[PDB]
Structures are given as structure tokens and as C-alpha cells.
Amino acid sequence: KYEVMYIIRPNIDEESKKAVIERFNNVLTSNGAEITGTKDWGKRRLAYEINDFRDGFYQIVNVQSDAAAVQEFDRLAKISDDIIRHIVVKEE
Amino acid sequence: IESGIAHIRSTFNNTIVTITDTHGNAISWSSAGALGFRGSRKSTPFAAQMAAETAAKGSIEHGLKTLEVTVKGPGSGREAAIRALQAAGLEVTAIRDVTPVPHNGCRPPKRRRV
Amino acid sequence: AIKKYKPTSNGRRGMTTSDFAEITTDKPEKSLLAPLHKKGGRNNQGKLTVRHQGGGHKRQYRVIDFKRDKDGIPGRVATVEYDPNRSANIALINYADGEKRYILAPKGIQVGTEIMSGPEADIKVGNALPLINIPVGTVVHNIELKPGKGGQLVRSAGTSAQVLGKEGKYVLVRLNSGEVRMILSACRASIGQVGNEQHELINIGKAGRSRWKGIRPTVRGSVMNPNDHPHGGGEGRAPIGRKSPMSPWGKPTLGFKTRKKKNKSDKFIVRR
Amino acid sequence: TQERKNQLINEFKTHESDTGSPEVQIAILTDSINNLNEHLRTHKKDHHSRRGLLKMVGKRRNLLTYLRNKDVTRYRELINKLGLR
Amino acid sequence: KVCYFTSNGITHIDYKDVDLLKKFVSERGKILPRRVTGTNAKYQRKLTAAIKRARQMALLPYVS
RNA sequence: GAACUUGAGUGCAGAAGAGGAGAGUGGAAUUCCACGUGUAGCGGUGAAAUGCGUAGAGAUGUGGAGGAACACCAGUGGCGAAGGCGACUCUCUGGUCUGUAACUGACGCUGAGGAGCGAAAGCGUGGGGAGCGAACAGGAUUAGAUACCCUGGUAGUCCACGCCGUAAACGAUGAGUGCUAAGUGUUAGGGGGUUUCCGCCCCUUAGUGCUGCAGCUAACGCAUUAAGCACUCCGCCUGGGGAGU
């Protein structure tokens, strides 16, 4: 179990943003890491700037995994430039 | 111009007042040592008052009226300099008590009597 | 890592080699080899134009792609082998087609890993992307300066660079010896460290182990005669009697910068 | 967890109710020492876990001497099962 | 004072509760101590863990 | 040799923790770099001077590089055998506490020698270097000033592995166990007496503070976290110096 909360950068069109969420869900389905719940906060104003941005989109992905494709998510989200943040919190 | 921000940095030696423009462009500057006080009198709030008076005169010479004053640095002359910006023909609206707070950062130089 | 010898004699007192544990096979493939004529430092004209070289063990050249021409076709490391032609090890990779190619061996690559090399390949140690596609701050070797030419910049054992950001047609890269250079962003580079990394920590031991690598001895100029060198002469261990310690020609050596003053690529060098 | 201990219980039960009964307990100690020791082969700079492993080795050795003084054949059959030699 | 989490019975504080964390955090951005908000030791521990995680996702500020 | 379950340990159930090791990431600030503002100071002191500065500094705005520590939480709070451990996140992993009753049935305590951990400084190899800073230099002070003060600044501090194996390594208090008034905060638990609660009270653990009776002590003081009353085991002392030579 993991709560996977990440910030997609705002200057992104809606079908491309669906392609981003589909991308990282395709990355999580490399495990068997079932997606037990989704949530989009939407455009929130960040409390401080991250790269250049005041604002960003939030995505919460609830995962029940075997702790591997979470790390594949970490490496793919430190690389993909259409993301501002990510955290994975062990839901315990 | 009309609006700027007054950066006062009053530390245990000097009370430096620079009246700058809102996206940071210094209109005029004067210090406690610029007024003529060379010694420890630089730390006294009378020199901070005088330095604020001269910076206020230069700012009115360029024409700005409503400041937004940021106190920086641990010293003594911050209150008199805020008061002297008021009494010299300007308005002090906001008071930003912004001394540079490191969270943990670098280690300080050693304590003095050792 | 590093094999340290025991001092059974005075020739092997401090001597260390590597244990060569990264290597799998000692056979290279006949289809990729090429001959090496030793030159001895000599020229077209036959004159000695490089000192202190020539006369080691005979070597046979292994052809290596520094270009990474093959795009989108997945590779697979067949072996990791010894190369005498360079400090690092070399990875013989099988593609799906049968083009068996040598590449350099990054630090930590093992036999049987996928190596893609296209523009849209995955970022993984072994892959080779152009600098447009490489994200900022990843360790990078086999950089090239002209797109399509072949790897130039970070290419020997245990060496590494890093993408310090992008601007445009160019890419900020921190090359080894800390130099920040604008490199044309369409230039392919491979991803990672290079993979001996303990080659620098090898105590050669004998005088002759350096001569096995084709290194002739070096006479200091202070021992020579005054016609041979500007340090020559003096009646018994004279110091550097000139100001500015000099080469065997008319140029000072310590500190004297020898880069051209109108070098055409100082515009692309940010820090040095 | 929870297949290793449960299989070692069900394997080294001498009665049905045995979760004590030092053969169950030594076998849990052996496989926990083995998981810990593979961790130590990964992380050699961990010393607090080594201290815990030395405490485990002390527990299991004292349980072995108790089986040696209690039941000889049971002790030898435990040794031949676990390979603890 | 009175503890919040003992009163409303609520357990693990759920970082998504940005408004509750914004109540416990002071004006500049700091975590208020236990003698101001009146919570328990345990609940202050889970509060500060929550605030630090929500700061690193910019749900909460650092400096203002 | 046979029995027992209190001591010890396994089982189940929760709880808390800066317990450790590996990787990744963050936000202040400091320094440095480039550019705009702009002019004559800044810095520092008991007083000054050296430094920095018109070749444009300090202040100020933006951007970048890089290193190290992790404000507020934070607490006679927690964990660890001790050293010690404070950002966050995951990976692996050690121990503890609580409720028992399911099991074992004395499996326990202590431990010379041995094996390991072991702050800081130091050493080797390779990196790293922002701040600090031995050494060293300049300026002051001074009778002198190899000092305190000021301005600079090397190794080192940092990291990987290896060595050292030492501290006022302290609770100046060995480990285990049992017994021997109270009052009182607090940390993690448990159960009860009304209430579904909030919460009050009662009760019990294990840890952690203070005041205190008996008892001890030369006294200071310790006092259920003993320095009491006992038993077990280990280590150590027999005037000061020379000499930890």
C-alpha cells in the first residue's frame, strides 16, 4: 500500500495530461501494482515556486504493490519533465 | 516615480539605509558612516535616524512617496530609522521584520572570549 | 577490484595489478579485429615526433562504435572483455540482427542487459541518447562534438560527465577536469560512468611493466648536454639555472598556457 | 514473515500446540539468522543488527545445549534437519 | 488547553487535510508548540510529521 | 530419574521510537559567479588598524554553481549496551514495551581470556571543499604578546573503504534478581466506574524527573531509577611523588 501524490506541471493540454496520467499508470502496472483509488485536486497554487511555477496539478494514486514499480515510478518521475513533484508514502 | 521599498540593514556596527525601487533598483543610499560618524557612533540610533533622514531627502529628490520598509540585521537603530522616515515627509506602510534566518546551515565563527 | 602482489622479490615490492573480475572471456571476435602496426612515435617522414614511446607488447585493434549508429534495435551485452587499446574494458553486444559491436563498458553493466540506442530510448546505464533527450544531471560518457561523427569527450576508464542544463541548440556539460562546455544538442552521448574505475590505482612495479605498455624511458633535461636541452650542462647537478623551467624546445612549461589565443571554440567554453 | 514462521512451526511441531518446544524455536532462529545474515552481506556497515544477530546466536546456542542435555536423538535429528553443523 | 485529536477522535492526520494543518501552523509558517495548541505529545508528533510532508509537496509553506 | 510454572523463552495481538545501514529529494541561509540600480564607503573594534572598495565594493534585484548542517517541532521527550542518534521519503534490518494465555519447562545469571562496537582528533588511498578553522601571515594590545581581540587562511571538518582504539568514554555509581513509607509531574501501554462521547476518577505495568520516611554515609547527600537490606558473579584499590615513567 502506497499513496502516490505528484504534481503535473500546469502548462499542459488536457489530452496530453491524460496521456501523462496514463503513462505513469502504465508504469505502475508493470508490477501488478493495482490502482485502488484515484483523486485529482486540480490546479492548486503552490505555497512556493518549484521550477518556475506558482501552480500545479495534483494527482493521488493509491497503489497496493510489491515495492518495485514504486521505485520505477520514482526514477521515471525524476526524469520526466512534465512533472513538478512526487512523493510515495507507505500508507500505514 | 512614486513607490519603492526602503531596505534598512542595521547591524552592531552600521545602520545602512538604501531606498530602492519595488523590483529592486536603488534610488539613493546613505549609511551611518556616510553621514560622517566613523566610530562606534555608527551603532547609535541617532546615526540611524540621520541616515534615514538623508536617504529620505534623496528619495524625495527623485520623488517617491509611499515606501514599504524592510528591517534587516541585528542592531539598535531600526525603530528610530522607521520613525525618521515618517517625520521626513514619507509614509511607512508595511514593516517587514526580515533578518536573514538560516535554518541550520553553515556553522558560525567561534565564540569570542575563548 | 585490485590484486596486490606479495613482495617475493624487489621487482614486485609495491606492484599491484587489477584482478580482472569484470572480464568474462579472453577471446575477442575475429570479425571485429584489425591489425595494429606500432609506430614508435615516428612519422611519415620517419623522424621521432613523439618521445618515450614504442616497443611494447604487440596489440591487435578492436573496432568500437563511438557513433552508436544503430537506433531502435535493442542490444544485449554478450561479453565484457579486455582492450589493450584503451584503459577501459569493452562490451561486446549482440543486436537482434547479428551486428555484433564493441562499445565501451560502463561502470556496473553486466552480461545480458538491454541496450537501446535510439533518440527515444529509455535512460539507463548503457543506452545512448542525444543530449536533447537526456535529462539534466545524469552521468554521461562517450559524448561527441559533431553529430554523427562518433564519441569524443568522456571515453576512458572511470570517467564521467554530467548535463548541467540546456539552452537551445546547445547543452551545458561539465566535462572531466571540471570544464563547462556548450555542446551541440544533437550530439549523441551514452549514459553513465565508464567501467574500470580502479585503473588509476595500479602501482606498476617494475621498470619493465611500463615498457610492456610501450613506454621508453625519460631522461631529464638537467642530465643532458647544452645542445640537447636548455637545462643541460652545469658542472654537477645544476638547478634549473634559467628562469621558467623549459621543454627541450623554446617554451616554458610550468603554468604556461598553450591553448591558441584565437581558438574558435572559446565561445562554447563557459568555465574552465 | 508469516509464511516462514508458520511453515517452520508446522514443520517442527512435535505436538500440535507447539509454538514453544525448542525445536520450533531453534528453527525460527536459524531462518531469522539467515535472513539477517544476507542483509549483513548486503550492508556490511550495520552493527546494531550484528549485535542483534549475536544475541540470536546466543539464544539458539543455549537452546541447542538444552536439547543436547535433554534429548540426544531429538538434538541430532534437529541438527540433520536444519543443517546446523 | 484541550487536545484537538482526543476531542474529535480523529486518527492518522491525513496530509490532504491542508486546512487542519494550516490551523496548527503559525502565521509565518512555523509549527506551533504543544503549549500553544494544547495537543498531546503523540498527536504533536504525527502533526509535525504531517506538516513536514505537506511542506515538501508545497501544500504548506516554509517561510512567510 | 520423574513432575511443576512463577524465572527464562517461543506463539498471538497491538503501540511507540532522532535504533541502524543504502539510495533519492527538499527549503532557508552562507560563499562565489554574471548582469541591472548607484555612489563612497563597507567591514571590524573596548579604541583602531590590517583587509575589501571608484578597475565600482557593502546595500539591493534576478539567475546559476557548489558544499555542509537540518530553524519552528524540541520537551529532566524518545530510542540504543555504550559511543551515540534530529529535514523528508522509500529499500533492507535490530531491539524494546504492553495484554495475556496457547506452548516449552529451569532452557537461567555472571563471565577472566577471546571476538566485536567504540565520540573527537589522527593515519592511508581516492574524491570533496560552502562556512568554519589548527598551522601560518598581516593588524592591534602589551614592558614583551609565538595569546585572548581583528582581518586572512592550510590540513582537517564532509564522503567511500581500511587503520587507531583513546575521552571529565560521567550517574565520576558493573551486571542480574528479590525485598524496603509516601507525595508528585511526565512518556508509551492496559483495565475498571456513569456517559455512545468529550472527559474525570480509580487501578496496574515498563521507562523517565523532583521532593521526601526508615535505613545508609565522614559529610555532601542517596533514598523503590539506592548510596538501604541481602544473595550471585566480574572488574578494580591498598599513602603521595618518581609514574602510567
Swiss-Prot record, chain A:
Induction details: Strongly expressed during exponential growth, decreases 2-4-fold in stationary phase, part of the rpsF-ssbA-rpsR operon. The operon is induced by DNA damage by mitomycin C.
Membrane spanning residue stretches: none
Keyword Kinase: no
Alphabetized UniProt keyword annotations: Ribonucleoprotein, Ribosomal protein, RNA-binding, rRNA-binding
UniProt xrefs under CDD domains: bS6
InterPro entries registered for this protein in UniProt: Ribosomal_bS6, Ribosomal_bS6_CS, Ribosomal_bS6_sf, Ribosomal_S6_plastid/chlpt, Transl_elong_EF1B/ribsomal_bS6
GO biological process per UniProt: translation
UniProt keyword Ligase, yes or no: no
One Gene Ontology term of the molecular function aspect: structural constituent of ribosome
Listed GO CC annotations: cytoplasm; ribonucleoprotein complex; ribosome
Record-linked Pfam families: Ribosomal_S6 (PF01250)
Cited PANTHER family: MITOCHONDRIAL 28S RIBOSOMAL PROTEIN S6, SMALL RIBOSOMAL SUBUNIT PROTEIN BS6M
Subunit structure: Part of the 30S ribosomal subunit.
Family membership: Belongs to the bacterial ribosomal protein bS6 family.
Stated role: Binds together with bS18 to 16S ribosomal RNA.
Protein name: Small ribosomal subunit protein bS6
Organismal lineage: Bacteria, Bacillati, Bacillota, Bacilli, Bacillales
Curated annotation (Swiss-Prot), chain C:
SUPFAM superfamilies, per the entry: Nucleic acid-binding proteins, Translation proteins SH3-like domain
Tree of life domain: Bacteria
Molecular functions (GO terms): RNA binding; rRNA binding; structural constituent of ribosome; transferase activity
Disulfide bridge map: none
Region (Disordered): 218-272
Keyword RNA-binding found: yes
Ranges annotated as biased composition (Basic residues): 257-272
Reported function: One of the primary rRNA binding proteins. Required for association of the 30S and 50S subunits to form the 70S ribosome, for tRNA binding and peptide bond formation. It has been suggested to have peptidyltransferase activity; this is somewhat controversial. Makes several contacts with the 16S rRNA in the 70S ribosome.
Protein name stated in the entry: Large ribosomal subunit protein uL2
Lineage: Bacteria, Bacillati, Bacillota, Bacilli, Bacillales
Gene (UniProt): rplB
From Swiss-Prot, chain D:
Signal peptide positions (record): none
Biased composition (Basic and acidic residues): 1-18
GO CC terms of this entry: cytosolic small ribosomal subunit
Record-linked Pfam families: Ribosomal_S15
Source organism, top-level taxon: Bacteria
Region (Disordered): 1-21
GO biological process, one term: translation
Protein keywords: Ribonucleoprotein, Ribosomal protein, RNA-binding, rRNA-binding
Recorded family membership: Belongs to the universal ribosomal protein uS15 family.
Cited function: One of the primary rRNA binding proteins, it binds directly to 16S rRNA where it helps nucleate assembly of the platform of the 30S subunit by binding and bridging several RNA helices of the 16S rRNA. Forms an intersubunit bridge (bridge B4) with the 23S rRNA of the 50S subunit in the ribosome.
Quaternary context: Part of the 30S ribosomal subunit. Forms a bridge to the 50S subunit in the 70S ribosome, contacting the 23S rRNA.
Name of the protein: Small ribosomal subunit protein uS15
Species assigned in the record: Bacillus subtilis (strain 168)
Originating gene: rpsO
Curated annotation (Swiss-Prot), chain E:
Keyword RNA-binding: yes
One GO MF term attached to the UniProt entry: structural constituent of ribosome
GO biological process annotation, one example: translation
Subunit details: Part of the 30S ribosomal subunit. Forms a tight heterodimer with protein bS6.
Keywords: Ribonucleoprotein, Ribosomal protein, RNA-binding, rRNA-binding
Stated name of the protein: Small ribosomal subunit protein bS18
Similarity comment text for this entry: Belongs to the bacterial ribosomal protein bS18 family.
